[PDB]
Amino acid sequence: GSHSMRYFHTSVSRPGRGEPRFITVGYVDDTLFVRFDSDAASPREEPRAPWIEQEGPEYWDRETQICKAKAQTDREDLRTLLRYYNQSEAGSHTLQNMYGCDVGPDGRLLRGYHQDAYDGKDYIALNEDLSSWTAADTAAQITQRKWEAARVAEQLRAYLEGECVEWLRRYLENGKETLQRADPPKTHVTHHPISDHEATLRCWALGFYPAEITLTWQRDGEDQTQDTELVETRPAGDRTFQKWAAVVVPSGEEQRYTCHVQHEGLPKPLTLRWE
């Protein structure tokens, strides 16, 4: 199926206490595989997935240098954004960058991405044509005009149609036993009385990969999407995720309610009841 490769980077100024903190991670789909923290002794990119430890010393060397260089450029950009917005050097600010690529079943590129955010809001984003920029404000338009002078979109497009797709397919082949298996969710229904006339039905979906999951409660075939507490999907400490959906029903009418679970790892959509 379709697969993703993304790099996230975060730089945070630390006025008074020292250099900005820079932390970057790489994800293949929902599997983290590289990390880097500038606060280490001698900061170095490290493998967080088994299929990436295969790479040789030149790989980790070039990655380590790229991450240190990105930290330097992030300090540069933080100072520049300080002077763009006429802000105070005593305030802490955040810069967040993501970039990457989505490939299809045929391994062909569908979309490339490159986005930058300042203080948690969109700053500038490479359009889908890989040829234009969306700027969020006039400061981002300054940056846009400086980046159009430097053909940053052309460098990015050479990278995305080239090295991104190639190395994503490489990573996929390397660890296909894990990355290409869809772990179906273990599903069950729990019952917890809250009063003499009411009780919670909780629908679980433990043990699944990827994270994309659909949990729905239905009362006699009518969706209860407003009367259903639905929690965010969370990691289980491994590459596996968890998620549940609860509805509070009167004690006596449990069999009016049905849970419905949809996952990539399931052959058919599932329907569950409390037994």
């Binding site: 790099y7 790489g26 790989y59 070039r62 990655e63 790229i66 991450c67 260089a69 990105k70 450029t73 970039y99 430097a150 940053v152 460098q155 990015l156 990278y159 090295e163 991104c164 190395w167």
Partner: peptide, 7 residues
């Protein structure tokens, strides 16, 4: 592998 802007 990672990308790096020109400069």
């Amino acid at each position: 592998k990672r990308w790096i802007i020109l400069g």
